Amino acid sequence: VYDPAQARIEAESVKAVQEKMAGNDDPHFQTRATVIKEQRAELAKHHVSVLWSDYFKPPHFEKYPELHQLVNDTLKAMSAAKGSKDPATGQKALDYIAQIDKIFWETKK
Amino acid sequence: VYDPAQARIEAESVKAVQEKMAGNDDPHFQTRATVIKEQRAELAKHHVSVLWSDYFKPPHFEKYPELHQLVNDTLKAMSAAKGSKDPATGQKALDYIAQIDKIFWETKKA
Amino acid sequence: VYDPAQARIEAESVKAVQEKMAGNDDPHFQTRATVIKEQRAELAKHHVSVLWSDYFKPPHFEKYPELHQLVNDTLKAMSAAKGSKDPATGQKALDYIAQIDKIFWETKKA
Amino acid sequence: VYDPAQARIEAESVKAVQEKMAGNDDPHFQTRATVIKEQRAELAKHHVSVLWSDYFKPPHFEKYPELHQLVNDTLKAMSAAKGSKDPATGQKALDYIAQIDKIFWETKK
Amino acid sequence: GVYDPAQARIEAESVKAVQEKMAGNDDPHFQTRATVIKEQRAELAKHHVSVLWSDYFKPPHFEKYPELHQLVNDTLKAMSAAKGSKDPATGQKALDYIAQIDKIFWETKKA
Amino acid sequence: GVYDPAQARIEAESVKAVQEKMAGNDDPHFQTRATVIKEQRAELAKHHVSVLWSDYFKPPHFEKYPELHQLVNDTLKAMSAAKGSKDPATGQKALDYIAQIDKIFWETKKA
């Protein structure tokens, strides 16, 4: 059922929207890309938060003690991106989702 | 950016919920699982629709004359699964999404 | 029960918001109206989609071979309106919905 | 922009779902029709509440003094229907929306 | 289940909090984000206020307090004005209105 | 804008309120409606608790209170158990957990 792919696609969409904000400076487009970035950001946050609450059971946290702070930093990096036009912040959020994805599949093997 | 993975994952939750409905008889669980199935089914229907309306542009409908119908047959297979406890109806929906995933990537490479 | 009135009313909010964007220059209002236009546009797109997936059954697609495309052209006309301040793009979307409303009722009588 | 047609279609859907609950007694269908009835009911309530807050301006209330309690009774009748399997409660909610619709069009003339 | 205007107050306190942050800044991005947040939080403030009126407040509450109907409407309208404005004063007018509904709320929990 | 666990508490108080109404009744319709409401309100309780953890609580709050991370996870999981159960005791376990996060919340508003 669970997959971090839903967090990736929404966060891949945040960076995509940020790259497009650089090559167009029209007020209407800027506003629209801010409305979509806020929605896609909160959705990415939800999917990451769900992985932490509903999937990762108590023995997983005893196995990877840094997981708790990682999920928090992932959510926080995504909130920074939600507030930024810089694609690097969206990529920081993607790099943070990749770390969770690595740990996620290491619990399916 | 789009990816039919969003539809598949939500459709995979439907078949998984249908299967959990056969190993438990408790009225409260049957009720909860029905609510969840109704939620993920309409979410899967949303993701399939969005692909069709926002991703798939006119050159794709000319290259794939069957695409229009494949999407409608998926949305209806998923509506069937939404009102069925049978894991097969959910597996039928997943198989239609698999046909959309194949066409999707053939338009991403070249 | 279904009715394309739900799509038309939300699409009518889009054209009305586009028109209000031409008589005011205030940055805050342009911003608010853009947010609202993005909201009602996707709501209109939802109502058009739901007609196509849940109401329109296979005998309708055989009777109207152009229905599949009419719905996709509406969803795209509405996506154009969503990213345009031009009242015409919103009126183009309303005109496509009007073609869906005509076909809708022809299948309700007989 | 505003139209009570959105409240009608959702409340016409509540009565429709209640009629179908009478001709089928299978636990799965009953649960599904309860999930759809709860959603369609809250949506009907929202559209009626919006007509009252966003459309009807202060001179309209000075013109029809019974409007305030009508909108409340409409919302309450719809909450009774949300809780009932009886189609008559859904029709009571529809009859109450018809009264608002009558007053609505009498403000457009 | 359980109702409380504290839900309406917090989403309405968010509208004023956003309007105060819009005064010291000028950045096209920050201004836009605040408007998106103000539109959503004001619409949520309007939902909670409407819920108390329909779902919580029963018919005798309308006889005992005849002013309640017009008060809830003026709160919802004040919250629409706050949604449309950038001025913290219109956001505070809605908090003043919610405070009045809050006073009537706890009076009925005593009844 | 402004955060408060009172949002999490009320949606979590609704879960227990629903579970108590499920005990005295047996009606197939009333039982179903309560389950739909319990699923929605518990999922909303889980949202607010998650929001406080990511959006409100900053990094020094995690150093000062090292137990916070596991507490929020156990609250979210306790709320998942309440969502799955009909017993008011599991709905109260989540209120006990939220009460602990509430204590830590007001301590940081003093800091």
XYZ file of C-alpha atoms in Angstrom:
660
model
C 0.000 0.000 0.000
C 2.513 2.624 1.233
C 5.086 4.090 -1.137
C 7.193 7.307 -0.854
C 6.606 7.718 -4.590
C 3.643 9.945 -3.775
C 5.918 12.271 -1.796
C 8.500 12.274 -4.601
C 6.063 13.192 -7.407
C 4.663 16.109 -5.396
C 8.138 17.349 -4.397
C 9.440 16.803 -7.968
C 6.519 19.076 -8.935
C 7.621 21.785 -6.483
C 11.119 22.008 -7.993
C 9.558 21.918 -11.503
C 7.301 24.868 -10.659
C 10.297 26.763 -9.149
C 12.395 26.311 -12.327
C 9.505 27.715 -14.396
C 9.276 30.733 -12.050
C 12.791 31.740 -13.145
C 12.078 31.868 -16.893
C 8.886 33.988 -16.725
C 8.281 37.215 -14.763
C 4.581 37.964 -15.607
C 2.527 38.730 -12.367
C -0.284 36.325 -13.309
C 2.049 33.345 -13.910
C 4.029 34.118 -10.738
C 0.815 34.105 -8.665
C -0.439 30.865 -10.262
C 2.858 29.070 -9.751
C 2.752 30.213 -6.107
C -0.773 28.774 -5.660
C 0.239 25.419 -7.200
C 3.546 25.335 -5.233
C 1.697 25.835 -1.916
C -0.722 22.974 -2.672
C 1.931 20.545 -3.983
C 4.140 21.362 -0.974
C 1.467 20.671 1.655
C 0.592 17.424 -0.198
C 4.252 16.305 -0.159
C 4.328 17.069 3.570
C 1.166 15.004 4.171
C 2.542 11.911 2.360
C 5.827 12.082 4.329
C 3.979 12.587 7.601
C 1.777 9.551 6.788
C 4.843 7.337 6.168
C 6.070 8.278 9.641
C 2.782 7.752 11.507
C 1.039 4.923 9.660
C 3.868 2.826 8.110
C 7.031 2.984 10.284
C 6.167 0.831 13.335
C 8.093 0.998 16.725
C 10.871 -1.548 15.849
C 11.876 0.589 12.819
C 12.737 3.538 15.072
C 14.785 1.298 17.362
C 16.724 0.179 14.231
C 17.318 3.651 12.684
C 17.474 6.191 15.610
C 18.042 9.152 13.264
C 14.748 8.517 11.382
C 12.618 10.756 13.639
C 14.747 13.890 13.069
C 15.147 13.012 9.372
C 11.376 13.014 8.793
C 11.158 16.328 10.696
C 13.976 17.921 8.652
C 12.322 16.642 5.470
C 9.071 18.328 6.445
C 10.920 21.507 7.409
C 12.989 21.607 4.211
C 9.742 21.264 2.278
C 8.299 24.226 4.231
C 11.358 26.267 3.253
C 10.718 25.356 -0.407
C 7.014 26.243 -0.010
C 8.349 29.684 0.911
C 11.113 29.907 -1.725
C 11.457 30.398 -5.514
C 14.890 28.727 -5.449
C 14.942 25.245 -7.110
C 17.800 24.209 -4.802
C 15.456 24.249 -1.778
C 13.072 21.948 -3.627
C 16.023 19.709 -4.440
C 17.062 19.763 -0.768
C 13.545 18.449 -0.004
C 13.918 15.781 -2.713
C 17.353 14.725 -1.335
C 15.686 14.385 2.080
C 12.862 12.234 0.612
C 15.510 10.029 -1.053
C 16.997 9.257 2.392
C 13.564 8.151 3.671
C 12.973 6.155 0.455
C 16.290 4.335 1.042
C 15.278 3.408 4.598
C 11.737 2.539 3.408
C 12.936 -0.104 0.941
C 15.431 -1.409 3.526
C 12.339 -2.415 5.588
C 10.741 -4.293 2.665
C 13.748 -6.587 2.012
C 5.032 16.540 -13.587
C 2.771 13.472 -13.874
C 3.127 9.710 -13.273
C 0.365 6.989 -13.222
C 2.072 5.671 -10.075
C -0.294 7.956 -8.170
C -3.305 6.108 -9.608
C -1.752 2.630 -9.228
C -0.828 3.183 -5.542
C -4.370 4.287 -4.685
C -5.867 1.440 -6.728
C -3.533 -0.984 -4.932
C -5.040 0.212 -1.647
C -8.492 -0.742 -2.963
C -7.610 -4.366 -3.831
C -5.696 -4.664 -0.527
C -8.761 -3.428 1.405
C -11.044 -5.865 -0.524
C -8.772 -8.753 0.525
C -8.824 -7.672 4.171
C -12.663 -7.749 4.012
C -12.657 -11.527 3.468
C -10.655 -12.512 6.576
C -12.743 -10.561 9.103
C -16.487 -10.637 9.837
C -16.666 -7.830 12.458
C -19.368 -5.260 11.338
C -17.268 -2.241 12.451
C -14.251 -3.321 10.329
C -16.438 -4.015 7.267
C -17.813 -0.483 7.725
C -14.387 1.202 8.112
C -12.944 -0.636 5.149
C -15.946 0.356 3.011
C -15.378 4.036 3.895
C -11.650 3.748 3.060
C -12.357 1.878 -0.202
C -14.785 4.637 -1.236
C -12.072 7.228 -0.460
C -9.116 5.650 -2.330
C -11.284 4.609 -5.281
C -12.354 8.170 -5.990
C -8.724 9.287 -5.450
C -7.566 6.738 -8.051
C -10.326 8.001 -10.345
C -9.038 11.549 -9.825
C -5.431 10.652 -10.756
C -6.524 8.761 -13.910
C -8.709 11.724 -14.957
C -5.970 14.309 -14.377
C -3.623 12.340 -16.660
C -6.281 12.439 -19.391
C -7.151 16.130 -19.008
C -3.833 17.780 -18.174
C -1.071 15.473 -19.466
C -2.470 13.772 -22.589
C -2.438 16.360 -25.391
C -4.030 15.881 -28.914
C -1.013 14.241 -30.715
C -1.416 11.280 -28.285
C -5.104 10.729 -29.164
C -4.198 10.515 -32.862
C -1.266 8.143 -32.147
C -3.460 6.049 -29.791
C -7.112 6.037 -31.035
C -8.022 3.660 -28.211
C -6.716 5.924 -25.370
C -10.001 7.836 -24.901
C -11.884 4.564 -24.253
C -9.095 2.950 -22.199
C -9.342 5.818 -19.700
C -13.154 5.588 -19.519
C -13.030 1.793 -19.086
C -10.530 2.309 -16.218
C -12.727 4.881 -14.450
C -15.688 2.513 -14.718
C -13.690 -0.568 -13.676
C -12.653 1.465 -10.627
C -16.309 2.499 -9.966
C -17.152 -1.210 -10.095
C -14.365 -1.937 -7.569
C -15.619 0.890 -5.345
C -18.956 -0.926 -5.019
C -17.561 -4.469 -4.843
C -15.876 -6.490 -2.085
C -14.388 -8.778 -4.772
C -10.544 -8.482 -5.113
C -10.828 -9.295 -8.826
C -12.747 -6.100 -9.655
C -9.887 -4.238 -7.988
C -7.314 -6.274 -9.949
C -9.234 -5.511 -13.173
C -8.843 -1.780 -12.411
C -5.103 -2.190 -11.772
C -4.731 -3.984 -15.131
C -6.369 -1.105 -16.989
C -4.023 1.382 -15.239
C -1.110 -0.848 -16.326
C -2.223 -0.288 -19.942
C -2.226 3.509 -19.290
C 1.270 3.312 -17.686
C 2.637 1.568 -20.829
C 1.235 4.247 -23.186
C 2.376 7.010 -20.779
C 6.081 6.156 -20.972
C 6.042 5.566 -24.756
C 5.296 9.280 -25.107
C 8.020 10.323 -22.618
C 11.025 8.778 -24.411
C 10.387 9.806 -28.020
C -28.182 12.438 -9.948
C -26.099 14.582 -12.330
C -26.535 17.927 -14.136
C -23.902 19.985 -16.100
C -25.275 23.031 -14.258
C -22.607 22.308 -11.649
C -19.867 22.752 -14.265
C -21.506 25.787 -15.926
C -21.962 27.661 -12.605
C -18.301 27.174 -11.679
C -17.175 28.094 -15.202
C -19.377 31.204 -15.018
C -17.443 32.223 -11.901
C -14.214 32.021 -13.925
C -15.340 34.375 -16.728
C -16.859 36.723 -14.111
C -13.538 36.814 -12.209
C -11.603 37.449 -15.484
C -13.851 40.460 -16.175
C -13.322 41.854 -12.676
C -9.535 41.658 -13.303
C -9.761 44.296 -16.054
C -11.419 47.068 -14.002
C -8.966 47.003 -11.081
C -5.168 47.361 -11.001
C -4.563 46.759 -7.252
C -1.910 43.936 -6.862
C -3.737 42.333 -3.886
C -7.027 42.000 -5.845
C -5.249 40.570 -8.917
C -3.686 38.017 -6.549
C -6.969 37.070 -4.803
C -8.828 36.751 -8.070
C -6.064 34.530 -9.482
C -6.371 32.202 -6.459
C -10.180 32.069 -6.844
C -9.943 31.502 -10.620
C -7.544 28.594 -10.015
C -10.036 27.145 -7.492
C -13.256 27.357 -9.569
C -11.499 26.269 -12.767
C -10.375 22.986 -11.252
C -13.867 22.590 -9.712
C -15.429 23.041 -13.170
C -12.912 20.521 -14.507
C -13.982 18.102 -11.764
C -17.708 18.383 -12.613
C -17.076 17.884 -16.364
C -14.910 14.818 -15.614
C -17.453 13.254 -13.245
C -20.134 13.494 -15.957
C -17.817 11.625 -18.338
C -16.757 8.920 -15.870
C -19.881 8.272 -13.810
C -22.870 9.406 -15.909
C -21.923 8.763 -19.555
C -22.181 5.003 -20.139
C -21.040 3.144 -23.367
C -24.315 3.449 -25.422
C -23.748 7.258 -25.400
C -20.216 6.999 -26.863
C -21.564 4.927 -29.767
C -24.485 7.354 -30.322
C -22.115 10.363 -30.038
C -18.640 9.455 -31.448
C -17.500 13.027 -30.821
C -18.365 13.050 -27.059
C -14.970 11.699 -25.906
C -13.161 14.595 -27.641
C -15.750 17.245 -26.703
C -15.090 16.517 -23.021
C -11.296 16.653 -23.474
C -11.524 19.911 -25.459
C -13.641 21.373 -22.612
C -11.146 20.349 -19.912
C -8.338 21.925 -21.930
C -10.323 25.072 -22.779
C -10.906 25.394 -19.029
C -7.158 24.837 -18.311
C -6.489 27.640 -20.796
C -8.984 29.883 -18.946
C -7.359 28.977 -15.622
C -4.084 30.470 -16.883
C -5.594 33.423 -18.762
C -7.021 36.780 -17.659
C -8.910 36.987 -20.983
C -12.752 36.702 -20.610
C -12.945 35.043 -24.036
C -11.008 31.940 -22.942
C -13.571 31.620 -20.157
C -16.440 32.120 -22.632
C -14.887 29.455 -24.902
C -15.031 27.005 -21.964
C -18.683 27.874 -21.275
C -19.525 27.232 -24.951
C -18.001 23.756 -24.820
C -20.019 22.974 -21.646
C -23.130 24.178 -23.519
C -22.432 21.465 -26.124
C -22.196 18.879 -23.278
C -25.481 20.166 -21.734
C -27.283 19.658 -25.093
C -26.061 16.041 -25.446
C -26.794 15.397 -21.734
C -30.527 16.102 -21.970
C -30.963 14.234 -25.285
C -30.111 11.066 -23.360
C -32.475 11.890 -20.456
C -35.733 12.125 -22.446
C -35.486 9.067 -24.700
C -22.256 33.612 -10.151
C -24.494 32.411 -7.276
C -27.268 29.903 -7.913
C -29.192 27.634 -5.461
C -29.037 24.985 -8.187
C -25.909 23.613 -6.533
C -27.835 23.095 -3.289
C -30.730 21.471 -5.165
C -28.608 18.921 -7.074
C -26.860 17.807 -3.878
C -30.137 17.589 -1.923
C -31.876 15.874 -4.886
C -29.000 13.369 -4.586
C -29.690 12.793 -0.877
C -33.331 11.832 -1.500
C -32.203 9.676 -4.474
C -29.742 7.783 -2.268
C -32.457 7.345 0.430
C -34.935 5.830 -2.074
C -32.256 3.331 -3.163
C -31.625 2.393 0.496
C -35.201 1.070 0.680
C -34.934 -1.368 -2.245
C -31.660 -3.063 -1.187
C -30.694 -4.419 2.256
C -27.093 -5.680 1.620
C -24.638 -4.372 4.372
C -22.060 -3.175 1.823
C -24.570 -1.105 -0.204
C -26.125 0.322 2.979
C -22.690 1.477 4.203
C -21.770 2.991 0.814
C -25.053 4.853 0.498
C -24.468 6.194 4.027
C -20.977 7.457 3.071
C -22.302 9.189 -0.074
C -25.353 10.602 1.799
C -23.103 12.176 4.470
C -20.912 13.862 1.832
C -23.800 15.075 -0.370
C -25.599 16.376 2.740
C -22.664 18.429 4.044
C -22.149 19.806 0.497
C -25.822 20.861 0.273
C -25.423 22.560 3.657
C -22.299 24.425 2.477
C -24.007 25.799 -0.675
C -27.025 27.012 1.355
C -24.782 28.554 3.994
C -22.819 30.351 1.229
C -26.025 31.838 -0.253
C -26.791 33.287 3.178
C -23.329 34.715 3.916
C -21.935 35.731 0.528
C -25.013 36.543 -1.634
C -27.885 37.888 0.532
C -26.755 41.425 1.480
C -28.255 43.461 4.451
C -31.220 45.039 2.531
C -32.489 41.533 1.607
C -32.954 40.636 5.280
C -34.806 43.893 5.927
C -37.148 42.924 3.030
C -37.779 39.264 4.035
C -37.481 39.074 7.896
C -38.202 35.323 7.960
C -35.183 34.528 5.711
C -32.710 34.069 8.596
C -34.760 31.340 10.335
C -35.633 29.770 6.963
C -31.961 29.257 6.064
C -31.382 27.812 9.562
C -34.355 25.416 9.286
C -33.145 24.394 5.823
C -29.734 23.535 7.234
C -31.324 21.704 10.163
C -33.752 19.740 7.980
C -30.774 18.687 5.878
C -28.988 17.500 9.051
C -32.056 15.417 9.910
C -31.893 13.854 6.422
C -28.135 13.247 6.838
C -29.208 11.162 9.833
C -32.255 9.478 8.246
C -33.026 6.772 5.639
C -36.493 8.268 5.068
C -36.885 9.986 1.636
C -39.489 12.341 3.135
C -36.802 14.075 5.236
C -34.752 14.648 2.096
C -37.868 16.030 0.434
C -38.460 18.292 3.451
C -34.934 19.652 2.819
C -35.736 20.098 -0.891
C -39.023 21.919 -0.059
C -36.978 24.221 2.193
C -34.439 24.893 -0.611
C -37.354 25.711 -2.951
C -38.452 28.502 -0.567
C -34.940 30.019 -0.660
C -34.818 29.584 -4.464
C -38.114 31.514 -4.733
C -36.725 34.391 -2.655
C -33.390 34.197 -4.538
C -34.981 34.806 -7.944
C -37.203 37.527 -6.438
C -33.931 39.462 -5.820
C -32.771 39.072 -9.443
C -35.926 40.599 -11.007
C -19.332 15.559 18.363
C -18.137 18.532 20.469
C -18.307 22.161 19.236
C -16.252 25.246 20.320
C -15.712 28.784 18.769
C -12.017 28.402 19.630
C -11.748 26.802 16.162
C -13.258 29.924 14.573
C -11.102 32.227 16.732
C -7.762 30.595 15.766
C -8.413 30.638 12.001
C -9.607 34.240 12.457
C -6.514 35.057 14.536
C -4.481 33.715 11.576
C -6.157 36.226 9.230
C -5.026 39.160 11.452
C -1.532 37.580 11.904
C -1.112 37.432 8.106
C -2.346 41.039 7.613
C 0.300 42.305 10.070
C 3.103 40.492 8.213
C 1.946 42.068 4.910
C 2.647 45.625 6.208
C 6.410 45.395 6.795
C 7.151 43.531 3.530
C 6.915 44.312 -0.226
C 8.313 41.069 -1.806
C 5.999 39.805 -4.658
C 6.363 36.195 -3.451
C 5.783 36.750 0.302
C 2.751 38.971 -0.454
C 1.243 36.326 -2.718
C 1.756 33.437 -0.260
C 0.075 35.435 2.526
C -2.971 36.100 0.288
C -3.303 32.354 -0.483
C -3.094 31.630 3.269
C -5.507 34.482 4.154
C -8.081 33.255 1.596
C -7.949 29.668 2.946
C -7.909 30.540 6.660
C -10.720 33.114 6.306
C -12.832 30.568 4.423
C -12.175 28.090 7.262
C -13.094 30.750 9.828
C -16.372 31.205 7.937
C -17.022 27.454 7.961
C -16.677 27.053 11.742
C -18.919 30.085 12.414
C -21.542 28.687 10.074
C -21.306 25.262 11.734
C -22.054 26.709 15.195
C -25.131 28.448 13.809
C -26.604 25.377 12.095
C -25.235 22.360 13.945
C -24.802 23.634 17.562
C -27.363 26.423 18.217
C -30.832 24.850 18.553
C -34.280 26.647 18.240
C -34.730 27.869 21.873
C -31.291 29.556 21.646
C -32.790 31.708 18.907
C -35.763 32.739 21.080
C -33.596 33.464 24.166
C -31.078 35.429 22.040
C -33.031 37.149 19.185
C -29.915 39.012 17.957
C -27.909 35.825 17.149
C -28.997 35.363 13.482
C -27.921 38.858 12.345
C -24.755 38.558 14.451
C -23.570 35.331 12.759
C -24.289 36.861 9.316
C -22.339 40.004 10.201
C -19.457 37.842 11.461
C -19.383 35.850 8.211
C -19.540 39.112 6.215
C -16.862 40.788 8.371
C -14.698 37.736 7.705
C -15.317 38.162 3.951
C -14.115 41.776 4.199
C -10.977 40.641 6.051
C -10.384 38.107 3.278
C -10.577 40.940 0.739
C -8.529 43.503 2.700
C -4.883 43.820 3.779
C -5.767 45.991 6.834
C -5.453 44.309 10.335
C -8.430 46.393 11.531
C -10.902 44.435 9.369
C -9.331 41.220 10.654
C -9.904 42.476 14.207
C -13.539 43.420 13.463
C -14.186 39.735 12.799
C -12.441 38.721 16.036
C -14.693 41.206 17.904
C -17.739 39.581 16.263
C -16.548 36.018 17.081
C -15.918 37.160 20.705
C -19.608 38.089 20.939
C -20.690 34.656 19.620
C -18.219 33.078 22.068
C -19.894 34.867 24.987
C -23.299 33.508 23.899
C -21.762 30.019 23.425
C -20.554 29.521 27.002
C -23.853 30.946 28.337
C -25.683 28.042 26.642
C -23.228 25.453 28.068
C -24.511 26.670 31.479
C -28.161 27.284 30.407
C -0.255 31.885 11.435
C -1.068 30.892 15.049
C -0.896 27.270 16.304
C -2.679 25.596 19.292
C -3.253 21.879 20.328
C -6.832 22.862 21.202
C -7.578 21.996 17.548
C -6.140 18.499 18.053
C -7.927 18.106 21.409
C -11.423 18.932 20.049
C -11.222 16.553 17.065
C -9.835 13.951 19.497
C -12.623 14.715 21.988
C -15.047 14.032 19.097
C -13.560 10.542 18.618
C -14.297 9.649 22.290
C -17.774 11.314 22.083
C -18.648 9.109 19.084
C -17.335 5.917 20.776
C -19.615 6.543 23.783
C -22.691 6.940 21.553
C -21.871 3.619 19.814
C -22.267 1.649 23.098
C -25.939 2.346 23.861
C -27.139 1.832 20.259
C -27.319 -1.105 17.787
C -29.027 0.530 14.725
C -27.123 -0.327 11.450
C -27.489 3.271 10.210
C -26.444 5.122 13.406
C -23.435 2.785 13.825
C -22.317 3.410 10.253
C -22.653 7.218 10.449
C -20.572 7.292 13.650
C -17.789 5.266 11.954
C -17.705 7.724 9.007
C -17.496 10.613 11.508
C -14.879 8.815 13.667
C -12.680 8.099 10.613
C -12.799 11.758 9.471
C -12.361 13.362 12.905
C -9.509 11.002 13.881
C -7.742 11.758 10.595
C -8.158 15.483 11.359
C -6.832 14.934 14.886
C -3.787 13.276 13.304
C -3.293 16.215 10.935
C -3.202 18.873 13.674
C -0.774 16.810 15.798
C 1.493 16.361 12.803
C 1.316 20.087 12.015
C 2.528 21.050 15.512
C 5.488 18.701 15.138
C 6.619 20.001 11.737
C 5.357 23.570 11.482
C 5.409 24.813 15.135
C 8.143 22.918 17.058
C 11.559 24.219 15.940
C 15.016 22.471 16.392
C 15.945 23.729 19.921
C 12.576 22.403 21.191
C 13.826 18.961 20.206
C 17.076 19.366 22.180
C 15.323 20.785 25.288
C 12.653 18.034 25.141
C 14.322 14.842 23.745
C 11.162 12.748 24.307
C 8.944 14.840 21.953
C 9.568 12.900 18.683
C 8.510 9.495 20.077
C 5.607 11.157 21.909
C 4.098 12.703 18.745
C 4.464 9.350 16.921
C 2.765 7.502 19.778
C -0.034 10.098 19.769
C -0.575 9.666 16.020
C -0.523 5.864 16.456
C -2.854 5.984 19.486
C -5.206 8.063 17.344
C -5.020 5.391 14.609
C -6.035 2.750 17.172
C -8.974 4.913 18.288
C -9.996 5.222 14.638
C -9.990 1.422 14.383
C -11.683 0.698 17.732
C -15.159 1.263 19.200
C -13.829 1.400 22.811
C -13.794 4.892 24.539
C -10.613 3.867 26.401
C -8.498 3.975 23.217
C -10.036 7.360 22.425
C -8.994 8.537 25.897
C -5.437 7.186 25.468
C -5.025 9.649 22.604
C -6.414 12.512 24.708
C -3.856 11.616 27.425
C -1.096 11.757 24.785
C -2.327 15.114 23.369
C -2.475 16.473 26.969
C 1.252 15.734 27.285
C 2.028 17.579 24.015
C -0.197 20.430 25.243
C 1.885 20.751 28.420
C 5.077 21.009 26.330
C 3.353 23.526 23.995
C 2.559 26.171 26.617
C 6.049 25.736 28.143
C 7.544 26.901 24.817
C 5.171 29.918 24.624
C 6.899 31.009 27.879
C 10.418 29.715 26.988
